[PDB]
Design a protein around this ligand. Structure first.
Ligand SMILES: CCCCCCCCCCCCCCCCCC(=O)OC[C@H](COP(=O)([O-])OCC(O)COP(=O)([O-])OC[C@@H](COC(=O)CCCCCCCCCCCCCCCCC)OC(=O)CCCCCCCCCCCCCCCCC)OC(=O)CCCCCCCCCCCCCCCCC
Ligand SMILES: CCCCCCCCCCCCCCCCC[C@@H](O)O[C@H](CO[C@H](O)CCCCCCCCCCCCCCC)COP(=O)(O)OCC[N+](C)(C)C
Ligand SMILES: CCCCCCCC/C=C/CCCCCCCC(=O)OC[C@H](COP(=O)(O)OCCN)OC(=O)CCCCCCC/C=C/CCCCCCCC
Ligand SMILES: CCCCCCCC/C=C\CCCCCCCC(=O)OC[C@H](COP(=O)(O)OCCN)OC(=O)CCCCCCC/C=C\CCCCCCCC
Ligand SMILES: CCCCCCCCCCCC(=O)SCCNC(=O)CCNC(=O)[C@H](O)C(C)(C)COP(=O)(O)O
Lengths: 220, 459, 128, 67, 104, 88, 124, 175, 111, 178, 62
């Protein structure tokens, strides 16, 4: 199980970093997260895997909703090469996608932090396959890599879409659903992790460099 | 149990004394009433059978089959009145007479207490079927099909007759109850081996077994729709019922005489499932599907365990209903476009949405979706085979994939895509066809609700 | 100059990479003309019936009928028992059966031998 | 709310969406700063990791290579 | 059928077939819901080499990392009551040999 | 809702707008019925570039066999109208 | 880790083996050793239903933490002292495990070096 | 309730802890259970009271059917069909009853596993031992008879097992 | 009688009601998506209560309500496991589904 | 899609097609607009360098090297317009296209609604019926005795004629039918 | 007319479900099995009134 999860997450994170369709990028991200979940199960931490399921649902669903909003605005266009600068044209969508991308990369004290950070620090402290550990680290670097790809190609720079600009995200249904999932992706990790009984034995004594491994690799 | 037999013999002159434009109504109404009457046989015991008389008895294995036969007769009547509209009154009455005689022979076959009487009725079923196929079939292949249907059966059944009388000159009785109680082991000699083969080959060719199945595609393709319905849903189950009955006197020879037939059944199940993947004829695909399912039933009967017998009974009932529905669904398109090629009429979901829903439900049931009784039978048989040998889960598993593929293949070929442009004679679905589909499909899920009615005596 | 692309059965050669279409001669042009003429004649024959206001039903296509007949009914009359046909039939129809028989017989013999010695751990094995 | 196309100009923006986006970004950053101010140990670690080589042989009970 | 021109006015656009033209023996195998033989940007016998090399390298690396595992500089975890003998299946009538953990 | 119901006047305006941003044509000399080779003195490569610009502007591809034939802006507008089911 | 590099690239003869550890008697180097005690009764941990893996030597702090969590249900941020106590106990447990690991490594290397030296002395 | 015998389906004495509040904030669960009680449990109770009032005015009874014991298959002559039939039916009834006994034991085991929570490996050893004994006896009785089972085949299996045990005992006495 | 069971079963049961009204004169009108969305939101709000019960007391249950069929010794019944995983995942899935359905009302308007 | 194909493509046609494909794939490589314009101008100069070659053999040989270079340096994942034969919406609306003859089978209750539409439908059907005999005769007259050699169809020339075989082209379902 | 959704879609199903679980499902043994509540030191039992002793005089490594 651990080896299957490691190979799956590494391979899918490697495939995601060159895809031009945004839905393909998010699908490969989902596959890589499932591989990380399999890695968590392989090191005998089922409750951590379930917690990661619960925390991943929020930001993955709302990232897909943001991608769908972008697709609908630009006449059903899905290629990021024809998606220009939407940072100012789609303010709320940009905010939601940025928050979701930071949650997916385990930025501290967000929803993705409380599961992915513990998962990484737990695979760091276990009698496990060395290749699996290395592939997990490379995959959690590639995660930030493809999130950067999405943000940079879809929101920064100059427009590249057809000149008939029909961009409009002022619909209460879209705004309300995305805002609900945004509040979730901000606060659910804290709320849930502080309200469940401890079903693990925590790792309280780690070397400082290894405790910060996830942050370092994400930044690199 | 004459309360069921006599009303069919009364269906005969009622059909022959009916006014020229009221034959179908009377036949359908009274056949439905006879099915309602036969519904009472499902009240079985837990220890022995229902011994009505010295001649007839009902068991937990034969009662669902009798109910299925009496329920199938009205469905055949509705499915037949479309393409027989231009026929004369006398020939329509003759067709209905053939159907009624077939039902009567099947009813008497499923309840005979005597093996020679069972042989006589199980052989008498050939004449109405052969007449129907060779007289009311559409193309010139039908004649050949009839021959293929006839001799393939007889070459398997004539040795059995000999064996049967031989047994009666040794044990003194062919009554099933006495045969069961006075059972004795079969020794390992050449004479016993050939007696086993004579007792088994008729039911193995009626299944049909892989390698002996060549008659089935011809018979099920050149037959009229009612003929295909009765051939696929009931007449194939005669082999299973007969094997389940006759295996009580073949132990312990079966313990090693089943190896060639088990090997043939498994590998030919894989082979026929694969054959379904490349089929230009839509009726032949359903026929080969029947071959694969009956191969599974053969395996279940041959491994001789209670779970296998339960699964086999459930699978026979479910396959009968499902294959009859699939044949009727194909016949609707055939009657619309007068061709059997699968890639001729495409994208029919756009033109016939409710028919597409019927197709989807039939295909989902064909691939054994839970908790349908198809799945219950298949899973029980697979568990029994796994207990028999752990490696079987490979072959069985293979089949489970292939089936799904070809099943959805048929759907995706006939309902999805784009409609053929030059075909403009696709009229809206009639109420008769929708009612036929509903009366096929509702009993399936209703039996899913109460699955112990079709699990057989081993339950 | 650049690395060459070599075609396969499941990845065929592109048209623009085909040497045969870059050295042409007049008989090739004539052949293309007759090919287009046949295609256009068939297209006209189809379109005349396709647009007919009095046409109701299916336009019969002899190509489809020929294809289905060749795939179904023409096969046996054109069959000859040859060393290739006989060997392929014997292999593909006999080898799998004996292979599976050997595998299952070996497994069941091993299981029975384990049962006779009383060491298989059949505890809780009630249903069979 | 009616927003018309522009044809090579910046799209029309209503004040509500800008207010919502800025508010939610600000609340995210405030939450991060507040939680880090109150839960620094969750990121920087809570207990000092000891090094092993400065542990004496007396508490580790290893003999002076003689007996 | 995927290799046929998609911009042509086919009589059957989804099948990419014309009325009356010869069908081909394996048409149902090539219906473009199925086996595709279209040209690829990278040659066959080069895609296969890269895929097989990746898979074999990953397998051999996983085996190597199995026989050269990673761990932490700690002793085994200690549990009080004879390694929780009664908790993991009991058998309280056998008096298992005592396991003792000493302070350090 | 979705995009407004594109009209013939809008299509003609957009095509003329795109053509008047081309450096190789004179905006005053350009008319709806001006031929690309005859009146404007362009070659086949310029026509391919014009077709690609139209494809970029309207967001749908024109097949090469059909694109080879469009020689005046009116023909381009007509092809677009027949492609997108525009009748007013 | 550096211990991995020491074991896998350097001399693995003197490096501790995590699977087979400890390889010296617990009383070998120490004159006397105190028996490590437990505060939670077996019935107490059974009633708390902690885990088969949470019933370690720090189980009493976990039991107290769970009890305070249940008592202060709506205020899910009030049991920080108890969580800190449990974390400190587990930290001390991990420190003890590291101390055992180093004791074993030092014993291994000293024993093997002393055996080599004694063999050399007996070889001259 | 008194619907089932508490000896055949036993249960522990069900000790639960008392509410020991420590926080001044209200317990939302308490108000939720009070609301659920007053809004759902009381109308359902009134409806059930009406139904039982209607049932009490029409009291009729059904009885458990009693079967005598007939001679077993061991006391039947070789070709005496009537005695064979009666013994066979009695054997089938006993087989069904044994199946239901195994069912009861398995239900006990499953309930124990769910009830004991995280201590199930230690607190449900007795149910596991009872299931082991019952399963061993059932397997010795009825396994490998196969389809077309009968009392004669079970008797043959028992005689074969008896012969094997007797031979083992007689050869062990020789040691 | 321990509202845990009733609420856990009602959360699942009420989701099947629009499926039953799919044949009625609300599936043929334009108010069906809002009806389904409101049903899912109500289901999420109802399922929020067993989660609170578990977070307070750690309550877990299994409910074997319908006996489907019994083989010789194996009994098959309709049973639901309502432990921590189920009562934790149900509200999250319902919340996400409610958000996606509200999004779909806008995304698939022209379908 | 609308124009009848020819027996073969000319050299100029092949060169133009290769030019368009190279430009599109280079744009797929060069995401940004200014970089694309730079390299597209470079490609245009590269193309028009050999524009004036009088040797046809050398021209087709240069085209051969051009095709080889394009196949080596093509984009593995080129941009496709959403409704193009490789796009994400190529046949999305084909499930909503219903042929017009289906309306001939509507129940009279259904036809009770939309009376004027069905009146116009009757007028169109009558026009097609009247027109068919003439369309057939014109095709008979204009066809060479050795069968047609292309798939092109003639227009209408007579006073009130209609172009032959027009019904199924005029009555296309729609591009966004439902 | 306003809050009729909460009646026909929540109150009625919960009434039926509560009745079915209270008077039909729990009329058979082992149909609704609830795991044993956790008992902590210092707790008192509701039925027996038994109080649980405290926890072995913590070494107090404060
Ligand atoms: C769990 C759900 C509970 C639901 C409660 C209510 C259930 C009502 C069931 C009604 C009886 C079945 C009728 C089948 C024939 C269709 C009749 C019809 O033409 O309707 C048109 C009618 C009008 O529509 P229209 O505008 O004419 O549309 C025509 C177009 O073609 C457009 O057509 P369309 O695109 O709308 O297609 C119809 C639609 C639906 O049509 C169908 O597919 C019907 C057949 C479903 C597949 C059956 C084969 C699989 C075996 C299942 C066996 C279950 C039997 C249970 C007992 C049933 C007794 C009848 O297609 C689908 O939704 C997908 C079908 C595949 C579903 C896969 C489900 C997997 C299993 C799920 C659990 C099953 C066991 C439940 C218990 C589990 C443990 C708790 O629409 C309806 O009335 C609703 C459609 C029915 C949907 C029911 C699907 C869920 C129900 C599952 C079985 C029932 C379980 C009930 C007990 C609770 C469990
Ligand atoms: C197209 C599909 C149609 C259906 C196929 C039906 C399959 C029928 C196959 C019959 C199964 C087995 C038949 C006989 C049982 C054993 C077979 C034999 O090989 O085993 C050995 C037999 O030994 C030798 O093989 C002797 C037999 C050799 C002669 C038989 C001819 C085989 C040729 C195969 C031709 C294909 C037959 C099918 C034609 C259509 C066992 O040694 P032995 O202990 O001594 O014999 C046991 C009997 N005793 C105890 C009385 C002594
Ligand atoms: C028990 C082991 C079973 C493993 C499977 C063995 C091989 C199975 C081969 C199945 C053959 C079926 C043939 C007929 C199927 C219908 C035809 C068909 O599928 O068409 C192919 C269709 C078109 O391809 P696209 O890329 O989508 O094209 C889109 C652009 N045009 O795509 C498919 O469906 C192909 C799917 C076939 C998968 C075969 C490979 C699977 C092998 C799995 C082995 C690995 C096991 C996993 C180990 C996990 C670790 C424990
Ligand atoms: C409609 C609304 C009705 C409102 C009034 C009813 C209020 C409650 C009335 C209770 C009626 C009495 C009652 O239900 O008793 C239970 C009674 C008898 O008990 P059994 O377990 O069936 O006995 C074993 C033999 N089968 O069972 C019943 O009749 C009710 C069953 C309803 C089950 C709910 C639906 C679930 C099943 C859906 C299909 C599933 C197919 C198979 C699933 C496989 C699962 C492994
Ligand atoms: C992105 C990676 C792929 C890169 C691929 C591109 C690189 C290849 C570029 C170089 C290839 C060439 O120039 S190949 C040069 C081929 N030589 C000739 O064509 C000479 C004869 N001239 C004509 O045919 C016409 O004048 C014509 C030129 C068609 C103009 O057409 P019009 O005036 O009537 O519009």
């Amino acid at each position: 199980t651990l080896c299957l999860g490691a190979i799956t997450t590494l391979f899918t994170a490697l495939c995601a970093i060159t895809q031009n369709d945004i839905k393909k990028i998010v699908a490969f991200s989902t596959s890589s997260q499932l591989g990380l979940m399999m890695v968590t199960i392989g090191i005998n931490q089922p409750h951590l895997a379930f917690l990661h399921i619960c925390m991943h649902a929020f930001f993955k669903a709302m990232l897909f909703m943001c991608s769908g909003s972008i697709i609908h605005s630009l006449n059903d266009e899905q290629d990021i090469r024809k998606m220009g600068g939407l940072y100012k044209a789609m303010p709320f969508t940009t905010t939601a996608l940025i928050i979701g991308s930071l949650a997916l990369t385990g930025m501290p004290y967000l929803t993705g932090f409380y599961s992915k950070d513990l998962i990484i620090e737990a695979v760091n402290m276990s009698y496990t396959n060395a290749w699996a550990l290395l592939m997990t680290l490379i995959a959690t670097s590639l995660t930030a890599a493809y999130s950067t790809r999405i943000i940079f190609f879809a929101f920064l720079g100059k427009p590249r879409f057809p000149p008939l600009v029909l961009i409009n995200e002022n619909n209460p249904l879209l705004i309300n659903s995305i805002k609900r999932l945004l509040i979730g992706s901000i606060f659910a990790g804290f709320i849930i992790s502080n309200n469940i009984p401890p079903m693990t034995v925590p790792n309280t004594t780690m070397p400082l460099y290894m405790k910060m491994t996830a942050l370092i690799v994400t930044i690199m | 149990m004459l309360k069921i037999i006599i009303p069919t013999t009364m269906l005969l002159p009622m059909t022959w004394m009916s006014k020229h434009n009221m034959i179908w109504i009377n036949a359908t109404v009274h056949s439905l009433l006879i099915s309602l009457i036969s519904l009472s046989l499902l009240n079985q015991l837990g220890e022995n059978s229902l011994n009505f008389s010295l001649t007839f008895f009902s068991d937990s294995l034969s009662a669902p089959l009798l109910v299925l036969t009496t329920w199938l007769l009205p469905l055949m009547l509705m499915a037949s009145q479309s393409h027989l509209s231009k026929e004369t009154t006398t020939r329509k009455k003759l067709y209905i007479t053939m159907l009624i005689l077939l039902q009567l022979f099947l009813i008497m076959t499923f309840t005979a207490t005597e093996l020679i009487l069972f042989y006589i009725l199980f052989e008498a079923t050939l004449v109405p079927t052969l007449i129907i196929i060779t007289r009311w079939g559409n193309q010139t292949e039908r004649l050949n099909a009839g021959l293929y249907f006839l001799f393939y059966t007889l070459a398997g059944s004539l040795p059995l007759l000999v064996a049967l009388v031989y047994i009666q000159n040794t044990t003194g009785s062919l009554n099933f109850l006495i045969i069961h109680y006075w059972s004795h082991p079969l020794s390992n000699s050449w004479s016993n081996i050939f007696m086993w083969l004579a007792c088994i080959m008729a039911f193995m060719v009626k299944m049909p077994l892989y390698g002996l199945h060549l008659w089935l595609p011809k018979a099920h393709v050149e037959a009229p729709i009612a003929g295909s319905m009765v051939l696929a849903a009931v007449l194939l189950k005669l082999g299973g019922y007969g094997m389940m009955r006759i295996t009580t006197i073949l132990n312990p020879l079966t313990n090693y005489m089943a190896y060639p037939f088990l090997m043939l059944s498994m590998w030919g199940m894989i082979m026929t499932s694969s054959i379904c993947l490349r089929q230009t004829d839509l009726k032949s695909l359903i026929a080969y599907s029947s071959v694969s399912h009956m191969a599974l039933v053969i395996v279940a009967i041959m491994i001789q365990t209670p779970w296998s017998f339960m699964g086999a009974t459930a699978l026979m009932i479910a396959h009968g209903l499902t294959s009859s529905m699939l044949f009727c669904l194909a016949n609707t398109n055939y009657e619309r476009v007068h061709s059997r090629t699968m890639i001729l009429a495409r994208g029919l979901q756009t033109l016939l949405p409710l028919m597409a829903t019927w197709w989807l439900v039939a295909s989902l049931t064909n691939l054994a979706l839970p908790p349908s009784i198809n799945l219950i039978g298949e899973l029980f048989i697979i568990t029994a085979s796994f207990s028999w040998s752990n490696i079987t889960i490979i072959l069985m598993g293979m089949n489970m994939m292939i089936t799904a593929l070809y099943s959805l293949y048929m759907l995706i070929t006939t309902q999805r895509g784009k409609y053929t442009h030059h075909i403009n004679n696709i009229k809206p679905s009639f109420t008769r066809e929708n009612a036929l589909m509903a009366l096929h499909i509702l009993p399936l899920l209703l039996l899913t609700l109460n699955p112990k009615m079709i699990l057989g005596p081993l339950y | 100059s650049f690395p060459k692309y070599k075609p396969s059965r499941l990845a065929t050669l592109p048209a623009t990479l085909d040497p045969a279409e870059y050295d042409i001669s007049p008989e090739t042009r004539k052949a293309q003309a007759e090919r287009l003429a046949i295609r256009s004649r068939l297209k006209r024959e189809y379109l005349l019936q396709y647009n007919d206001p009095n046409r109701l039903g299916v336009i019969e296509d002899p190509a489809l009928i020929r294809w289905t007949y060749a795939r179904s009914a023409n096969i046996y009359p054109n069959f000859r028992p040859t060393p290739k046909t006989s060997l392929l039939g014997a292999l593909f129809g006999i080898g799998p059966l004996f292979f599976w028989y050997y595998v299952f017989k070996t497994d069941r013999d091993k299981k029975e031998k384990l049962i006779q010695e009383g060491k298989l751990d059949q505890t809780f094995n009630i249903s069979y | 709310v009616h927003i018309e196309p522009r044809y090579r100009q910046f799209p029309q923006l209503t004040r509500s969406q800008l207010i919502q986006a800025e508010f939610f970004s600000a609340t995210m950053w405030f939450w991060i700063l507040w939680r880090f101010w109150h839960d620094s140990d969750a990121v920087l670690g809570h207990f000092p990791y000891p090094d092993p080589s400065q542990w004496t042989d007396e508490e580790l009970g290893i003999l002076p290579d003689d007996e | 059928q995927q290799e046929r021109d998609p911009w042509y006015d086919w009589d059957h656009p989804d099948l990419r077939l014309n009325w009356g033209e010869p069908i081909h023996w394996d048409l149902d195998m090539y219906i473009r819901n199925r086996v595709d033989t279209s040209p690829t940007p990278v040659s066959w016998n080069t895609m296969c080499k890269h895929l097989f090399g990746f898979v074999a390298f990953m397998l051999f690396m996983f085996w190597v990392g199995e026989i050269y595992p990673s761990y932490q500089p700690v002793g085994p975890k200690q549990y009080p009551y004879n390694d929780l003998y009664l908790e993991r299946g009991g058998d309280p009538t056998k008096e298992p040999e005592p396991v003792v953990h000493y302070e350090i | 809702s979705d995009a407004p119901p594109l009209t013939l006047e809008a299509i003609k305006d957009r095509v003329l707008y795109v053509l008047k941003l081309y450096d190789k044509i004179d905006p005053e000399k350009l008319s709806v019925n001006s031929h690309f080779m005859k009146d404007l003195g362009l070659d086949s490569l310029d026509q391919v570039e014009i077709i690609m610009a139209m494809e970029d502007e309207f967001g749908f591809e024109i097949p090469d066999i059909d694109a080879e034939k469009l020689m005046c802006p009116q023909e381009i507008v007509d092809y677009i109208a027949d492609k997108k089911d525009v009748y007013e | 880790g550096a211990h991995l590099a020491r074991r896998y690239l350097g001399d693995a003869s003197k490096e501790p083996d995590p699977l087979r550890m400890p390889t010296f008697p617990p009383d070998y180097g120490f004159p006397e050793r105190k028996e490590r005690e437990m505060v939670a009764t077996q019935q107490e941990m059974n009633d708390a239903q902690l885990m088969l893996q949470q019933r370690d030597y720090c189980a009493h702090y976990l039991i107290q933490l769970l009890k305070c969590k249940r008592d202060s249900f709506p205020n899910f941020l009030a049991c920080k002292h108890e969580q800190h106590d449990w974390d400190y106990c587990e930290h001390l447990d991990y420190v003890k495990r590291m101390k055992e690991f180093e004791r074993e490594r030092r014993l291994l290397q000293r024993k093997k070096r002393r055996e080599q030296r004694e063999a050399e002395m007996a070889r001259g | 309730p008194d619907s089932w015998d508490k000896d055949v389906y036993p249960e522990p004495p069900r000790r639960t802890p008392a509410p020991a509040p420590q926080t001044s904030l209200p317990n939302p669960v308490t108000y939720l259970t009070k609301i659920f009680d007053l809004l759902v449990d009381r109308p359902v109770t009134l409806a059930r009271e009406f139904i039982e009032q209607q049932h009490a005015k029409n009291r009729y009874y059904y009885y458990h059917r009693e079967f005598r014991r007939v001679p077993d298959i061991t006391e039947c002559e070789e070709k005496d069909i009537l005695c064979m039939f009666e013994a066979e039916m009695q054997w089938r009834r006993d087989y069904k009853v044994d199946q239901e006994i195994v069912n009861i034991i398995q239900e006990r085991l499953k309930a124990c596993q769910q009830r004991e929570g995280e201590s199930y490996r230690q607190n449900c050893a007795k149910e596991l031992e009872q299931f082991t004994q019952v399963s061993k006896a059932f397997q010795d009785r009825y396994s490998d008879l196969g389809a077309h089972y009968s009392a004669r085949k079970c008797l043959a299996k028992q005689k074969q097992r008896m012969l094997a045990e007797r031979k083992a005992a007689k050869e062990a006495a020789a040691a | 009688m321990n509202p845990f069971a009733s609420l856990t079963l009602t959360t699942l049961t009420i989701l099947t009601i629009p499926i039953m009204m799919s044949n009625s004169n609300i599936y043929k009108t334009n108010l069906y998506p809002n009806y389904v969305k409101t049903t899912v939101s109500y289901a999420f709000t109802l399922s929020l209560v067993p989660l609170l019960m578990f977070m307070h007391t750690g309550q877990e249950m299994i409910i074997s309500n319908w006996h489907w069929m019994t083989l010789q010794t194996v009994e098959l019944s309709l049973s639901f496991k309502m432990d921590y995983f189920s009562v934790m995942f149900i509200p999250v899935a319902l919340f996400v589904t409610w958000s996606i359905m509200e999004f779909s009302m806008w995304y698939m308007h022209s379908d | 899609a609308f124009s009848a194909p020819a027996a073969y493509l000319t050299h100029q046609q092949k060169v133009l097609r290769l030019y368009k494909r190279a430009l599109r794939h280079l744009e797929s490589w060069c995401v940004h607009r200014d970089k694309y314009r730079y390299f597209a101008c470079l490609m245009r100069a590269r193309f028009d360098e050999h524009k004036n070659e009088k040797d046809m053999v050398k021209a087709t040989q240069l085209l051969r090297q051009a095709e080889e270079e394009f196949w080596y340096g093509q984009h593995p994942q080129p941009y496709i317009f959403p409704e193009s034969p490789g796009g994400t919406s190529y046949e999305r609306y084909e499930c909503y296209k219903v042929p017009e003859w289906c309306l001939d089978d509507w129940h009279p209750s259904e036809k009770a609604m939309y009376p004027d539409y069905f009146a116009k439908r009757e007028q169109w059907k009558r026009l097609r019926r009247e027109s068919w005999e003439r369309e057939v005769k014109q095709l008979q007259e204009e066809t060479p005795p050795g069968g047609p050699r292309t798939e092109a169809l003639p227009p209408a020339r007579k006073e009130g004629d209609l172009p032959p075989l027009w019904w199924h082209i005029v009555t296309r379902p729609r591009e966004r039918p439902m | 007319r306003h809050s009729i959704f909460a009646v026909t879609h929540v109150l009625i199903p919960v009434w039926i479900i509560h009745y079915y679980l209270k008077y039909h499902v729990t009329a058979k043994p082992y149909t609704v099995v609830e795991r044993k509540p956790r008992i902590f030191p210092g707790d008192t039992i509701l039925e027996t009134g038994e109080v649980i002793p405290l926890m072995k005089e913590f070494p107090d490594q404060h």
